[PDB]
């Protein structure tokens, strides 16, 4: 069926192709001094998506023919049980390929090379599990909250100037996040204004719609009203019959029927002393000039997830017919006001006492990588989460990676026959990360690889890649460790990858036809 | 059929070249260690199937103009026959083409050579009876059930690492069915859950539909009703018309009749204690509301082909108009539930009485290799199936194939002039079969061919080739068999469409199946 | 998958056009003898606009794919907290980049280079809280109200031969604009000529609607009534109801934001009460504040529950085109100005003007502090800042310069639009800052050096610490990142 | 002398401001070491000739107006 043939070696070669390919942009990427990329595409795609989460765009779509799919789906299963904190795993696989050439001078049997990736897990554990790093993250943790991993993801991203304070503000989040729950309840917009904070936690939801033009501006000791029915009225299930009147009399006593609705609605609304009403969907026009009278502020076509927290936030009520106010539904009272922020107009909710659903707003420096916000919250809601039940973590700033390559180099030349040449390509893998962090920063890799050895050689685990110093430094003191998990699987992912030659064996070749 | 008339070296090539592609592509996929082949096509295909079935993706697609379709499609005719055992009836049929070649030297008339099938009939029946065969097949059986061929059909395949396991369970399935009513309600669908089983047996049928929203959760000592008529009411021949009334007060009246239909559904229902309703065609919606309150689960537009198994099941039913229920239906009552599986929601209909038919239910990791089950699947109820109505097998493993050759070689001397040189290379055909099982196992392919030779020569049936091995060992050990008649069938047809080929110039299409 | 993707090398470029190509339109329209640019685009631009404001052209359109974009909607953050004055902000930014080509000479690490951006933020204030400008302006002022900045800004524009009048009048526009109200209710139109004064200052709001060709042209002991239902609809019974309750008031005009029925409309005119159709919400809600308020509902609406102010309502001949003038309110809180001119196409630019003056003198009372103009603090600065350079060791001392010599540009851009000889105006320049006189600076009409202060040209101290800080805003931080394209939609 | 450029600049600068003559560029060293232990000086007529002849010779540039002759070799 069909068939773009390729076999022995040109097989192996759209591997090598696919793994390339996506080193480079994803290089750039890692580290506080990485870089931002705009892809554009046509049809289905909104303006040019910005993502410093390389993990995101790889999700999202399949540009082309080559294999590289399956490998790029793996990633997201690391996202789960742990994932980000800054993307690597996906450069060190794609260089284990560059070797496949020197293969070809050996000329006959890789399968026999393939006892490496066995060699491989050894490192995995050798470089982990000695030397004592951190323990704790329990649960809620009064300092421990923040001010290290969140900086961390946020640092490659280009928003650090001001946003190291916006990531802190993220556990904060979290924390109400923690309990019962799984993931639901959390509302993010940014706006113009400008301030040194750059962001507001809000005790309770935002919203932003308004009844009309009249109306008072605000309201005091306010109870909220929220209805599953809407306010219109008039044909039903079966209408009770086409009507027909003999004079512009009798259709009168029609209009008479509607006043009555009009009318229930403010005899016992006065009663509970209604501050806000929330619908969900189409509202009544009669009801409009009733309220304003009443100095009660409506919100039209309001949308129904934003009611659904909302009800959690105020102990709630049941939803039916307009028998619904007084004791049936139950209303918060600290403040809900239409307030001007910067330069627009928002409606708040505000002052719940139960405390368990919380909206953030964010404000802006006003650029487009301002919209980047949603982007750089939704990521910061759930690094935080890994880090407080993997209690386990390894020094960055690609600490881990010269040290790992170190003991790998003795492996390989150390043992005398074939076994020798497998292993020691294994081991230069681990030498270009550390050439890619320097990279980006400013400072020619040549003079940083030669400074770096040494002192991850010598045996402080502490010691990294300083990128503002241009040299070498203690990665502890700048604050930037990653998960346990992810190093543990990046490796074991990366070797299944390899894994899958030798499990076939022989391999043909193309295709029936 | 406009034309493009081909004779005698080049009509020759088209069949002859035909015969060639297919030949080095399945031939790949025979034994025990057989090789994936990955397919690309563009348009209604969207990704790489890896089949390694030699006649699922031949009847898949119909690629090019040069004649062969036919050739292929027959073979599934022979599935239903005997079924697949391991693909090898294609390519002994391809290589007698091969010496087409030195008949061009030979230079009279090929239709005079044709003779040779004529003693390939004297052939194929001198293989039968000859080769000393399995014995036994008691019936149901303890430990013979399986564990043998169905192993063996899936040795080839890449999921044996679970598969074996599973593919053990069909020989189960073809226990129950054995009996008089022949091969009918066999029924298995995947599923996207992961168990280390792989697969579940239900003692029922698996559907897959439901009623609505609302209905009750579950039905004890259930009923069932299958209705041929639809639920719908209005049209018939003879209409009525289309209406306009005199008071519109009298389009009530047929309002009203609509009802009618409704009571009666409902009157006799709850008498019958009705668990569930079966409707294989659209479902009118008045009765929807009426099964909900009464405790009744229905099916809109079930489909047939499930509704036919599903009546042998129960006991049957007569299926006409509403005047069905009751003792015109006859319905079996274990246990109807919809049972969550691990995440996608399902109908599980079981406890059928009659033991006569019953459905197998899969399970995996998520991922292309656990759809392979759905592959592998297919495969594994033919091979048993055919198993016990031939009572006979063949060694497999390439022991039949070696015996042969020794006794052809001997005939070629024999028969007379002309006719002998065209025996003869029928003869050193069945050579590259032996060649072609050792050269996928990693092993030297000329060692292999003499030693195989010998040990046939000798007298033992058992022994064979052993990829693993290298060398020949006893195939019986492994437990590698074919079914008796897939050899039989192979040496006839083959030797049928062979000689097609010379005799036919005008080719194209059109009749049975 | 991509688009444009530049670093280092390349990436410089795309920011070192962005800023050359900005600088040489901004440069005209400096000081008092700036010059007006007209752009035109032929898809959603309507017409020509004419923006002697650096900062309003720049913010409505992105035009091309190199990067500024970004740059230009910093200006407008600073605008909210001051703005304008004269735009010169934009300039100082795009030569700091000219420098970077003699940088590649160096053929190293620009990130060492970096640390004069630092040692800018020192420069940056020596050059505040130094060399005193102004005091008083707390609040109100009698003479100190204007007579200064606002006609500065006007220097700028061409229109100041008569129009420095009519930027004085703008600060009593502001004073009456303080209190809770924030930032609204301020309406202004200009027409066509006939007058020296070239404005009125209306006490009221000024509206251009008429009823019809029919009705009395004049109102006396004027009442006014405000409908929120239209007239739009037994037909003559209501006809009746208007007359009924109007006659007692004595109803001279009616108001209503909407469609109204055309059977009242002959009622109005034998009556003798003018009404307006369809008029336009926005006046009649600052109206109501301005006449005492009414209640709008039903027909119910006229007598005590709605209230009419009474001084005067009559539509008046300005010089040649009919308008109605609504007048004579006694609580004073909202104002309307309208603006008077000789048939010109620069008169248009009066519409300009106006809404950028009350932007001006709202954060001049607010900063409490200013800067002399002409370019004086440019040389000043430059001087002082040739002498860090200095004070800086080995490395850092090149780049520090280059920073410092930047500065002197600024005053030859200055003197280039004069039609003055460039070369001797920098020499010259230079003497009478380093000298200590804070007043002197560049006099274009005098083609040397001249007192800033005379003349009354002053900047905002906020534009100037501002301007420092964002003398950096990443120049340092675009070499160390890679991509920043960005906005034009999909 | 296939060392990083931008490290040399900075630390050479330093060191000629420090006060002593000896220290100089050693691009074996890679870095900035003491020229006078390597033993590499420059005759002393060199340096005070060109910096009279260099302005001179510059200075008839400018000054003088089509320096014309033959073809690009």
């Known amino acids: 069926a069909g068939a773009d043939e390729e076999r022995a070696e040109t097989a ?198 308004k009844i009309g033009v009249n109306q008072p501006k605000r309201i005091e000791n306010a109870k909220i009203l929220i209805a599953n029915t809407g306010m219109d009225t008039d044909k039903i299930k079966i209408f009770g019959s086409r009507v027909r009147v003999d004079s512009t009399a009798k259709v009168a006593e029609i209009e008479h029927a509607e006043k009555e609705k009009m009318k229930e609605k403010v005899e016992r609304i006065l009663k509970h002393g209604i501050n806000c009403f929330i619908n969900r969907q189409l509202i009544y026009n009669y009801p409009e000039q009733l309220f304003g009278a009443a100095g009660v502020m409506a919100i039209e076509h309001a949308d129904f997830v934003g009611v659904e927290r909302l009800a959690l936030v105020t102990g709630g009520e049941i939803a039916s017919t307009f028998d619904h106010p007084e004791l049936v539904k ?82 390989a030349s150390r043992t005398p026959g074939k076994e020798a040449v497998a292993m020691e390509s294994y081991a230069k893998a681990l030498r270009m990360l550390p050439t890619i962090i320097a990279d980006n920063a400013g400072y020619d890799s040549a003079d940083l690889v030669a400074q770096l050895r040494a002192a991850h050689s010598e045996g402080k685990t502490t010691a990294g890649l300083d990128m503002k110093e241009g040299t070498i430094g203690d990665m502890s003191v700048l604050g930037i460790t990653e998960s346990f998990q992810v190093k543990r699987q990046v490796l074991l992912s990366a070797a299944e990858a390899a894994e899958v030659i030798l499990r076939v064996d022989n391999i043909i070749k193309a295709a029936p036809r």
């Open 12 to 209: 192996r070669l759209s591997s090598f192709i696919g793994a390339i390919a996506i080193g480079d942009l994803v290089k750039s990427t890692l580290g506080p001094k990485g870089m931002d990329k705009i892809l554009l595409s046509s049809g289905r795609d909104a303006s040019l998506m910005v993502t410093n989460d390389g993990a995101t765009i790889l999700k999202n779509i399949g540009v082309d023919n080559p294999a590289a799919k399956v490998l790029v789906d793996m990633s997201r299963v690391q996202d789960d049980e742990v994932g980000d904190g800054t993307t690597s795993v996906t450069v060190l696989a794609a260089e284990l390929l560059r070797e496949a050439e020197s293969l070809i001078a050996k000329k006959i049997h890789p399968q026999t090379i393939i006892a490496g990736w066995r060699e491989a897990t050894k490192a995995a554990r050798q470089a982990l599990l000695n030397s004592a790093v951190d323990h704790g993250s329990d649960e809620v943790k009064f300092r421990q909250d923040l001010m290290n991993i969140a900086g961390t993801t946020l640092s490659s991203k280009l928003l650090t100037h001001h946003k190291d304070h916006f990531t802190k503000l993220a556990v904060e989040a979290v924390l109400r996040l923690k309990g019962s729950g799984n993931l639901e309840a959390i509302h993010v917009i940014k706006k113009l204004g400008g301030s040194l904070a750059d962001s507001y936690l809000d005790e309770g939801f935002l919203l932003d719609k």
């Open 330 to 411: 139950l209303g918060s009272c600290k403040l809900i006001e239409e307030v001007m922020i910067g330069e627009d107009k928002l409606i708040h909710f505000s002052g719940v006492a139960l405390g368990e659903a919380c909206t953030i707003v964010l404000r802006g420096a006003t650029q487009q990588i301002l919209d980047e916000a949603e982007r750089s919250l939704h990521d910061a809601l759930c690094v935080l989460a890994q880090t407080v039940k993997d209690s386990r973590t390894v020094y960055g700033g690609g600490c881990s990676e010269m040290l790992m390559a170190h003991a790998v180099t003795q492996l």
